[PDB]
Amino acid sequence: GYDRHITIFSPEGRLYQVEYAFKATNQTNINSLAVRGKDCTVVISQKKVPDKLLDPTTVSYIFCISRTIGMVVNGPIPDARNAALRAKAEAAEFRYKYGYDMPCDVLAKRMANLSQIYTQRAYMRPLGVILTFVSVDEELGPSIYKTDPAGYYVGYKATATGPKQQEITTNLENHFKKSKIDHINEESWEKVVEFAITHMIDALGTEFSKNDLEVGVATKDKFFTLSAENIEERLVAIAEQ
Amino acid sequence: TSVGTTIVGVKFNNGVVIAADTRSTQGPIVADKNCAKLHRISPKIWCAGAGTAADTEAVTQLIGSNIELHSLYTSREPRVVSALQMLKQHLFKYQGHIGAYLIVAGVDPTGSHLFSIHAHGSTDVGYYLSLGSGSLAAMAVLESHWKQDLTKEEAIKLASDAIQAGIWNDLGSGSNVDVCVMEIGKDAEYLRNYLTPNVREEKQKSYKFPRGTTAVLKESIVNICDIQEE
Amino acid sequence: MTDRYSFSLTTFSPSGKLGQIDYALTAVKQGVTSLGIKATNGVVIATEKKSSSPLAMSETLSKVSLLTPDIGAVYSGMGPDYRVLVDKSRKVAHTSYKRIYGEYPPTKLLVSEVAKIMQEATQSGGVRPFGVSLLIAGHDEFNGFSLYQVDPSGSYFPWKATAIGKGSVAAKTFLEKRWNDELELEDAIHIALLTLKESVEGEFNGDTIELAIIGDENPDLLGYTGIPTDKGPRFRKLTSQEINDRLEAL
Amino acid sequence: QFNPYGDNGGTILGIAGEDFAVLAGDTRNITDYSINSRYEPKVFDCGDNIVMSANGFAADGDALVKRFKNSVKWYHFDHNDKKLSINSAARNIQHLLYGKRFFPYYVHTII
Amino acid sequence: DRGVSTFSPEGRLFQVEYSLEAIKLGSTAIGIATKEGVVLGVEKRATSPLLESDSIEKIVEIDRHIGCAMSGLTADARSMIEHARTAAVTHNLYYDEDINVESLTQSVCDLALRFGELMSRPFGVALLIAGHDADDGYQLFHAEPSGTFYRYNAKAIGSGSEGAQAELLNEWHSSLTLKEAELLVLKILKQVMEEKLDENNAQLSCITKQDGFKIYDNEKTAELIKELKEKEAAE
Amino acid sequence: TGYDLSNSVFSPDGRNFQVEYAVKAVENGTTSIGIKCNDGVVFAVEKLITSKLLVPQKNVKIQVVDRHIGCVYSGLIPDGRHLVNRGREEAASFKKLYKTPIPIPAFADRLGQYVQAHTLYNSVRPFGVSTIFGGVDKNGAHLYMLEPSGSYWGYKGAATGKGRQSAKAELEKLVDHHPEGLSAREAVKQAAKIIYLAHEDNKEKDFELEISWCSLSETNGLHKFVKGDLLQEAIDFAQKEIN
Amino acid sequence: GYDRALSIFSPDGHIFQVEYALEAVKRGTCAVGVKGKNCVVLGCERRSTLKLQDTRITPSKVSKIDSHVVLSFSGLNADSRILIEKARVEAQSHRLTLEDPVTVEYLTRYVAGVQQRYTQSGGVRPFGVSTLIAGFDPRDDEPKLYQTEPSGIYSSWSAQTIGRNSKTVREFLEKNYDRKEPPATVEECVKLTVRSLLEVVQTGAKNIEITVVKPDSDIVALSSEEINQYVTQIEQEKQE
Amino acid sequence: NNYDGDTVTFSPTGRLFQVEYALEAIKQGSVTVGLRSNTHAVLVALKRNADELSSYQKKIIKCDEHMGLSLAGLAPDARVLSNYLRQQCNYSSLVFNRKLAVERAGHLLCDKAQKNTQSYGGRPYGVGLLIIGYDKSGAHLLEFQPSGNVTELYGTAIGARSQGAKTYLERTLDTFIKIDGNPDELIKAGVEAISQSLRDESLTVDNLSIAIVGKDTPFTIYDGEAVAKYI
Amino acid sequence: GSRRYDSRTTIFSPEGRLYQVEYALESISHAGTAIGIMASDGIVLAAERKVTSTLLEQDTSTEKLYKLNDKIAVAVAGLTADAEILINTARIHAQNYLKTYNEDIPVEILVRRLSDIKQGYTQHGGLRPFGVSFIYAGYDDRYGYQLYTSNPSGNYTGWKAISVGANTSAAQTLLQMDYKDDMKVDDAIELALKTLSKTTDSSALTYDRLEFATIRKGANDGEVYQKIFKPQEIKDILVKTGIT
Ligand SMILES: [Mg+2]
């Protein structure tokens, strides 16, 4: 039964090491969510600092890949940082070779191809991570593209990842069934963040303080993460209506 | 490199135009009287080349090939800045030994663009440019008549007038004017032999020989067909 | 580090079977149905856009891919394997042909190059076979229209019409009854849509079906005018609206 | 253009007696018309009762003596502290010098 | 399976220990060192009477002052001999002198542990290296596939080794002549050999300061065998 | 089963058992700690005196990287030395290209990516050490701890080895009782106490205390070993607290 | 590159891959070598399980390495081609550098060295081939016959056989070959070689190949009829 | 058990069995003792013969004029590691005109041994080493294990029955450290130490091997009648 | 490490057999039968396509018979993809020889080259062997018309008539029965088709299940012509020989 140890086909045509890499994805017990506005793309992720000896400012699963592209990761931090360092290198090389900023969907494809290689080559293991790339692309506009250990990737109107992804996914599905549009019809990113947090609260059935969340926002020509005080301002607005 | 050629590029209202003469030379001898110097990198990115003719053709095809694969990979229409970056980094690596001097022009989702590139890998930006042995004659016309906010018709006129200056005044240039117009939101229109001001006059005499004039030793049929059945 | 797997991972079993190839074909069997039909004046290739989630934008996932202006490809099996094969197929059409002969390869020879890549993943050190079967449709001046199937082993066969994946056995029987050597391209598209409906459970429309053709030259898709000999690509992906129009005459 | 060689002057003299040998050399080191040092030792005790001097370009001279001294050290390591005889040292120095046949040590060596 | 360079729980390399078993199956080779020279003798052990026994080469010259006998998988010894000859000649080229017997032996033993996943396995042959140099006189060394070499006054290797070594324990003393050593090798070879010892199935050799390494003629050895028979019948 | 016989193999749980077994080697090692203070960091380690024949103060465990970073580790000591050697190469190349000494977060990732790389293949073994390291850069003091998996975070206080539970509890008290912060000299005293308290898990043999520190005011942002009078003062403070 | 140690020692001191290579030799068709006073004869078995064979073009069992040396074998046919090619290249290299053709012993020593190398190199298996190498040294009239095997050991033989049922034909040769008086003529040597194969072969038809090598590069292969005459004469003397 | 097939595999309790098996080879090796004062450092080694016809295997190797070691375990591995030390001592002198510090020599040996414990295909070294030396900080004694662990000590012993000598040195610690400027008395203490590890056999003239290095004493090895004075 | 997953494709069994070669030969025994017959005035190659479909485009299809050059052709039995790798290498070797010597490569030299490539995969590299057996039909001016076969071991032999693939035991007996040395191409064509018709696992032998080729000096005067038969031409020869 060595077909379960390396990335070769089982008699059923399955790759067990890929399937087990998907399971490692949920080891952190963290859920993330991404949505698109008119002018922006917002990604939120749960933040859990279980040890009091930790410096909470260094605990993060959101990465600034380039000026325009942001990436949230679902999976263990070592593999997350492995993927983060590579994505940063790939995005910088692209700009140097081709003279324009690497698009979000193209970076996703590139990282998906790298992942595909790990599912075909035996000496390389898959990374136990799911990567959600976000930006406001200069051609396609607000963009969400997500990659997994199988080397699969696709664009999203909105998406969710983690142990309780299904609850969040269905909640988001129900909203877009009502509105009948592919995005959050809102001018400011602040309100799109408020929408994202509100619908995660509804889906998970939990309340959040300023230290329980992590937020990334993509606008035209920049991606940035919110501070605890920026998130606090967001939580206050949610509670006041 | 090869001394010869007049090529220009001119920006206008809603796009860019490039033009070239049609003479290729080997020393003082005219090899081809109707050469095509306007090369396609991609449907809406065109370039014109001076210097070593094989190098301008080869470097255009290579980058054009890689641009096509890049376009397919990214699901995006190719950009002029990508062609420029790939051309310059290739040329720089070869230290001038690839004798390609190009004017690169085109339209893409970002807008309309006009660049020049020199064999050692340096590039420049401009509203009007000229390259080749007839570049000084062409630039004289461009510096005399260029203005901001040219129309399509004015830019075609200026470009071809600049090529004509090269045709008449530069010995390295001659014959016809080729033009390619790249307008935003439109197909690029390649105008081969846009002007033809150098048709040879009828000869005084016909030099058709009487049949049997040439002395022949042997005749034989050449078998161009494959080995036959039966 | 270093790749220390320099030995074959696919080997002959006592019965003469190449296990990893058989298992790759099993993965293809589980895949979504795709098909191809050849007409007198064109070829059609089609498949279902099985969207993994309704929040996913399935237009961003292309199952039918342009390889050259006159050649297209569709698959059944593992999507990620297909995607990298399309990247390699596009590049090899340039490196081993267009940069040599100044023209795009004929369908049969590009198929031959893709087949070789798939064969090598069946014998080279430290790799598994590709878990896909490809259907490649194309046109070239001297061979006309053609349709080929390529399997995980690297074997390829030319077809008048065929299907691969989930409901291929039933679909091939359906195609045998309908196919003749006098079909026009519109007739082949009609038969393709009829055949594909049988293997599709849920929604059946232009947004859930991906369909492309190899037909007449499209000068409107060339992007430039002025060269008479350049008349445009023969590969054309049908729009969501174009598919729905033909679903009313179904 | 870069010239990898130089001339540090100096003169050396070796004489073999019946049961003794002397190796002498002046202590002056020069370039062109300048004195670098009035006392820069040029003849060296290399162990095993062997003395050596490599006169000419002093950088090559110092490099050769250094490598030979090192060769004496490793001869002891590899061959059970056997004394390196003068004839064996001479053959060894030939190989040190011929190793740079196409980029020579610009020196005249005497042991 | 398991690594080729794996240690056993006792702290021994499996492959080295197994190669020692292959050497136990080899034909007997004996060496005796004296102040008049070192004698080397071997059992040829032809597998059939049609095999021309003088083509069996289990005693070999490395240099004029160094000889060598082998036991075990004798095909493995060829590259070891090639290395030994090259090392001996190379040192003479570099230093205008003879190489020490110990230094030669050490050079050969450096090859031994160069195996892994370099060669794929250890050598399956043991060597008796005998010679003379000015510093340490007449010497006999036993080179193993472990990379270890011991100096010996007398040593036997191969299938009859422990019986022969017990015999060498009793017979060797520091005043042995070259002639006495020759007969002693013949006597002990005759004791441990399956077939009856003669000049065609056994071979003698020696190394002296004056004449260097010499493989004995079959006629010369035949006389020493006859001399042995008579002196054993003498009591 | 068999998933634990080879590095980089995912178990059906999604776990890398070989990395988890490396943690067991870390847990078997001596206690080492790190304390982040007001303008720097303090490192301390328990050194078991196996015999009287060990020369006191000679077998130094804490290591410097560049001139501003200190590193201490528990588990297989040779593995820790290998990691520091790499860290020194990383710091050298960073300073070569960018001139400025490597920032502590930058350095943390260099070690992290290298340790993570040893969980990607079956041809290598994971590191049998957890490393506590840090120092002072342009943005102030930083303390990190890095595990065999390649996982690392920033810390206020850190502990690893056999007496880590004891040490952690002591560190948690300091964090609660000093929200404003701890001075460098206080942190040295507290580090001595914590190692002495953590030595109860290793009570069979006696030990030797080793402390180092980087502080903006006390050491000019350079890594230095605590020696002589300052070390004795910390030992006395520690001995007073256990009695 | 593929570096796996395939040939390794077992607890009892055996290298099984080398020993299993000998089992491939045991399966191969029988080959025999007999040296006379002024010649060497190489006899080879052809299994008659394959008819409809084209004997003009089918690889012959005896191969010339040079104009004066020949090589026959028992075992894997494909493996033997690699050894034959290497030997032929070395034979020309020797002539080029030493300005003298190889001795039979030298050529044997080279082939045996290649075989040994393949028993302690990573990523390779031993040759499933044993060889008989025969000929005459340049300007020498003394017959030479050597044998090699997968392990890489080699030796000289007055007469030898390898391959399937070689135990039987060696039995014959050991009682029929006298060292004090070897086959004095070509006839006597060929006769003794054909006799030795007839102990094992089956039909004396196209199953026996005979090649005679004499001094000064005089090598010739006997035809079906010539061999058939030996086969006829042997059994007519046997009917008594 | 299932985790001792190679050096690249941890056991479920975090052990490296191939390294532990390499450590076992040292325990089978012959006893050797190391001890030092403030002026000198001494190695004493019990050499082992194959039989009565054979020589006694040499145990002590000189690395430089100021440094050397004694071995216990696989002798060829000691030759590899001592060759590496010779080179490193040599590099330091040639490039920096500097005698290699004994502590730095220990660090280099640790790192060399470590690489063989973390990679596939290789094996750990199967030998233990006792390094003595005199440098700019006085006399030194190191103990090397092929696990990579190197330790600076006043005195120690490795090999079979080394525990007896190690206990003796632990008792005598306060006496032998004070033997300054008296080489003969320091060697006596080492010969008395190694005697606590002997059974059935005693120290003879071709059995005993002694090495010493100190303030004005180059690393020198004594064998044969040169050690009869200490028997 | 990686050793754990190594099948060791290049090792002897205790009986001295190459496992992977033997198992590759087992694979080939299930492939469609290919037959080669050599006559005085030419060579015939006949081969059975494996259970086909009515929707297979036969006139553009090739799985059995391949051209190596104008004088040499091969019939394939086994993995088609493996065969094409070797076929392209053989095509290159033939051209290399033609460039070097300015003469067409002799048949055996080409056959030996391909067989040596197969041999290499059985002795070194740790890769699986090619699961292919070839029948080589060719002509050169030294030996004239020649038939060879090679198999995954890299062993090759010459033949007057030979079969590879499925039912070779039955096919070889039938060929051995009816083959004669003075036979002509037209007779050999009939023998090949009759042999396939009897050994086939299909219910009947039809044109759509066959590939057929002849190498004839039936090319106008002293030269050789290769003829890869078209589907209609296979249908005609089946009627002519009285099989359909
Ligand atoms: Mg993998």
Residue numbers in the entry:
A (entry chain G): 2 to 242
B (entry chain H): -3 to 226
C (entry chain A): 1 to 250
D (entry chain L): 1 to 111
E (entry chain D): 1 to 117, 125 to 242
F (entry chain F): 2 to 244
G (entry chain C): 1 to 240
H (entry chain E): 3 to 233
Paper text:
The 20S proteasome core particle (CP) is the key non-lysosomal protease of eukaryotic cells.
As proven by the β2-T1A crystal structures, Thr(-2) hydrogen bonds to Gly(-1)O. Although this interaction was not observed for the β5-H(-2)T-T1A mutant, exchange of Thr(-2) by Val in β2, a conservative mutation regarding size but drastic with respect to polarity, was found to inhibit maturation of this subunit. Notably, the 2FO–FC electron-density map displays a different orientation for the β2 propeptide than has been observed for the β2-T1A proteasome.
